[PDB]
């Protein structure tokens, strides 16, 4: 035998969580779900008063 | 969706002590309803439903590639206009200016 | 170029970076999977979005 | 076949957890379960002493 087989193999990739660098209150959302996003695009905006 | 739910789970799918058993996976699909029917026959979150998708026509569009310039959900009820504060400050300045 | 003026310039820079960061930018090209952010939510740098 | 079916469907929607921007104590509560509230309506009130 020159072959090893397993049926316990899944498909893995990179997933990134999105976290703010500040604290605020949300005012807009720009991507809902299953939507294409480019690098550098805004996904959330906060109230800029303070 | 580009994930099967088990992607982001915080716990092992199966126990370490037990053996491994194959399980067929499931992948969510987003379906959008017509809004003229909801207003007269409204729904509620978590109700069960039988879905059927017609797959006769196949252009080959699996992944969306169009970006949109309009935000989806926007709220500005928490924005406070600074008129009265600016008037109070002006009045105080006039008061303490002699 | 005087030492006193540059100190305040640094604080101006820090405040400006704080203001420019009220817009949250995507670091990677990809597709959105989970969305636990709604208008009006109170967000800290430890809350997933 | 030309069709695909599944009974594992469930209706979905949006939900917001109302949260305060400040700390304090409560003195009023303007709504209870199954109450229609419009955008810009007051839901809670705090003691303004501090």
Concatenating the DSSP letter of every residue in D7-30 gives EEEE----------SS---EEEE-
SS3 B87: helix
Given a contact cutoff of 8 angstroms between Cβ atoms, the answer to whether A43 and C48 are in contact is no
Measured between beta carbons, the chain A residues lying within 8 angstroms of C25 are 40-43
Q: Is B53 helix (H, G, I), strand (E, B) or coil?
A: strand
Q: Please provide residue C12's backbone torsions phi and psi, each rounded to the nearest 5 degrees.
A: -60, -45
Query: What ranges in chain B are assigned the alpha helix state H?
Result: 35-38, 83-96
Size of interface C-D (CB pairs under 8 A): 12
Resolution value in angstroms: 3.1
Sole residue written with tokens 């690098």: A39
- Interatomic CA distance for residues C40 and A47, integer angstroms: 10
End-to-end CA distance of chain D: 69
Fill in the DSSP letter of residue C26. Answer: P
Nearby residues of D8 by Cβ (< 8 Å), 6 or more positions away: B26
Instruction: Report CB contact under 8 Å: A29, C28.
Output: no
Over its C-alpha atoms, chain D yields an Rg (Å, rounded) of 20
Identify the CA nearest to D39 among candidates B86, A27, C43, C6: A27
Q: Which residues contact B82 (CB under 8 A, 6 or more apart)?
A: none
Closest chain A residue to C48 measured between Cα atoms?
A: A19
Half-sphere exposure of B71 (CA within 13 A, CB side): 15
Which distant-in-sequence residues (6+ apart) come within 8 Å of B27 by Cβ? Answer: B1, B3, B4
Q: Is C33 on the interface with B (CB under 8 A)?
A: yes
- D42: chain C residues, CB-CB within 8 Å: none
Residue A18: name the closest of C25, C8, D39 by CA.
Answer: C25
State the chains in contact with B (3 or more Cβ–Cβ pairs under 8 Å).
Answer: A, C, D
Q: Are B80 and A31 in contact (CB under 8 A)?
A: no
Q: Enter the DSSP assignment of B4.
A: -
Contact flag B65-A8 (C-beta cutoff 8 Å): no
């Amino acid at each position: 035998r020159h072959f090893e087989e397993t049926d316990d193999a899944y498909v893995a990739g990179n997933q990134i969580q999105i976290m703010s660098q500040v604290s605020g209150s949300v005012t807009k959302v720009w991507a809902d779900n299953t939507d294409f996003v480019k690098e550098g695009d805004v996904l959330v905006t906060l109230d800029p008063t303070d | 969706d580009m994930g099967t739910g088990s992607a982001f789970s915080l716990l092992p799918a199966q126990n370490a002590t037990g053996n491994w058993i194959k399980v067929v996976q499931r992948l969510p699909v987003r379906i959008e309803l017509d809004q003229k029917q909801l207003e007269q026959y409204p729904l509620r979150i978590g109700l069960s439903t039988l879905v059927s998708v017609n797959t006769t026509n196949r252009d080959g569009q699996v992944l969306a590639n169009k970006v949109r310039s309009t935000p989806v959900a926007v709220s500005t009820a928490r924005e406070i206009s600074l008129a009265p504060v600016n008037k109070l400050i002006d009045d105080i300045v006039k008061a303490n200016a002699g | 170029d005087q030492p006193a003026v540059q100190q305040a310039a640094t604080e101006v820079r820090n405040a400006w970076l704080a203001l420019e960061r009220t817009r949250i930018i995507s670091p990677m090209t990809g597709y959105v999977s989970r969305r636990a952010v709604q208008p009006g939510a109170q967000i800290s740098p430890t809350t997933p979005l």
